């Protein structure tokens with residue numbers, strides 16, 4: 596199932612992913628927090644999964660939120676680095692899904708991160724073309740949930 | 741405390757961590773697996789914590805082990821990248837510790853990784869100087885467990 600989803604990651608998709616990541620991944624703390632705060636602003640219900648982070652309204656200033664946001668970006672860094680070898684991408688994605696499955700995060704719920712990604716990309720001037728590429732990567736993870 | 745341990749990362753310690761990581765971090769899949777296989781060989785008692793990975797002796801051929809090993813290297817990548825800002829290093833370390841605390845991994849248990857790191861470092865021509873530098877980094881995580 597995950598292998599099949601990985602099949603949608605074509606040469607053009609992987610190229611747009613790497614190109615956009617070169618910019619987005621250059622400021623992990625800044626963009627990581629931007630992603631999380633956008634998620635919470637657009638889909639307030641998702642906050643229920645993050646009680647441990649405390650007062651998420653503090654954004655960057657919240658050490659726990661900042662710490663989680665940075666770690667999140669290194670997962671994406673991992674995914675991007677494994678794009679040229681489906682076997683490694685798959686094992687890394689499945690490894691990654693384990694904890695989210697335990698937290699009872701469904702594929703539909705996980706898909707809520709697409710809006711935030713689209714907006715973060717746009718803030719850096721990466722249009723719909725890139726947004727669609729990232730939706731495909733997220734789709735690989737969704738297949739593992 | 742983790743704050744006091746983080747202050748032990750002096751200028752030269754940070755430099756030796758970077759110089760050595762530049763090499764070790766070049767092959768995350770290869771060195772990550774070697775790191776885990778060495779841990780399981782020198783400390784068989786830790787294998788119990790990794791029941792989910794299945795047959796750990798298969799090494800590289802074990803998809804779950806390969807996935808975990810890669811993820812492990814990106815956590816180290818994360819730590820290395822945060823060396824410039826103590827505040828960020830701390831929040832990333834505490835975030836990382838959460839899951840290990842949940843699995844009941846004590847500071848003494850975590851410290852067993854020092855052996856494997858020293859051996860991998862040595863296999864790449866990095867001696868005691870570097871192994872001790874990494875022990876310092878590991879000690880930051882230990883202070884958070």
Ligand code: HEM
Nearest residue numbers: 641644645647663666667670671694695698700704705708
């Ligand atoms: C591309 C998007 C995402 C990435 C790359 C990502 C990455 C991560 C990473 C690396 C961790 C830390 C390791 C772990 O405990 O598994 C984590 C933890 C977590 N993730 Fe995800 N995640 C994403 C989206 C989501 C979404 C959409 C939700 C919620 C609806 C979610 C909920 C959680 C929770 C609850 C934790 C634990 C937070 C804490 O208490 O520190 N994740 N995620």
Ligand code: HEM
Nearest residue numbers: 786789790792808811812815816839840843845849850853
């Ligand atoms: C250089 C030291 C280490 C690093 C950087 C590291 C890194 C990681 C990472 C990134 C994960 C995946 C995210 C998560 O679930 O928290 C993890 C999982 C885990 N770690 Fe650590 N770890 C280290 C040492 C250890 C040691 C020494 C033990 C136990 C003796 C341990 C036990 C575990 C276990 C049981 C898991 C879950 C494995 C699975 O079910 O896939 N870790 N670790």
